[PDB]
Amino acid sequence: ARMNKTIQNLLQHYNISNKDRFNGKPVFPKEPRMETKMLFMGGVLETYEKLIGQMLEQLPNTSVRTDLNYILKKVQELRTNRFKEQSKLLQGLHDLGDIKMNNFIIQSKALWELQWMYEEASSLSNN
Amino acid sequence: HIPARMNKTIQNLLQHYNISNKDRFNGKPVFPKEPLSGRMETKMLFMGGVLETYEKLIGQMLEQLPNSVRTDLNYILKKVQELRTNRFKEQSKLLQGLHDLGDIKMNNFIIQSKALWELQWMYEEASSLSNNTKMQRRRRRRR
């Protein structure tokens, strides 16, 4: 309930018009098995950590801050206590997005790893 | 266990894509095998991610070509696309969600307010979900 009261306050500061609200992309995709929903929401809490950290950074000089640190703490607590497995997987998934596509050595290393990787992928299906 | 043609085609490719055994086995593989433990859901998801990564890769390997390497690449691209599509539809869907969350413009003010407009709903949903007495019972197992 401090949560919800702190959020309404922040909304006073992070005020946008309806024209901006509805025009453009919706921020999130739609919530999609239980393990599937947990992981997605682990994605979501992680996003909020990231998001609120930029908000703090964008505050002047560097109560609003007091408010932001509260929701940051709360989001962090939930992720740390109840989303540990999901977070280890999400990191794996982010790590794949960092591989250097243009690098010749990596291309050739990946190429060599393809055989095992395609064996494994194939067998996971006809199980 | 894989097609002969896949194996053979990969070997032919490794001729053009030639590197020292030192640089190849420097203790840093491209793709970890570590996330192929735990549940079937986790393995399928991670594997779906690897197949998506390879499709990107092979793409670039085709761009960085000038002017039978090209057909060997195109063949290897096709077999990966086909496996993804035919066995990893559910996983690709989720992954597109996760990739999308990853891409959000977090330093933009409009985005911050829209995201903030959903925090309560999203926190509540996160919390509610994260004890259904199978998720709570599963989290107890690993302690």
UniProtKB/Swiss-Prot annotation, chain B:
Induction details: Strongly up-regulated in response to viral hemorrhagic septicaemia virus infection.
One GO BP: immune response
Locations listed in the record: Secreted
Residues bearing carbohydrate: 7, 18, 131
Record-level Gene Ontology MF annotations: cytokine activity; protein homodimerization activity; type II interferon receptor binding
GO cellular component: extracellular space
Keywords: Cytokine, Glycoprotein, Secreted, Signal
Main location: secreted
Superkingdom in the source lineage: Eukaryota
Description of how the protein assembles with itself and partners: Homodimer.
Protein's job: Cytokine which binds to interferon gamma receptor 1 (ifngr1). Also binds with lower affinity to interferon gamma receptor 1-like (ifngr1l). Has activating effects on macrophages and neutrophils.
Family as reported in the entry's similarity comment: Belongs to the type II (or gamma) interferon family.
Name of the molecule in the record: Interferon gamma
Gene that produces this protein: ifng
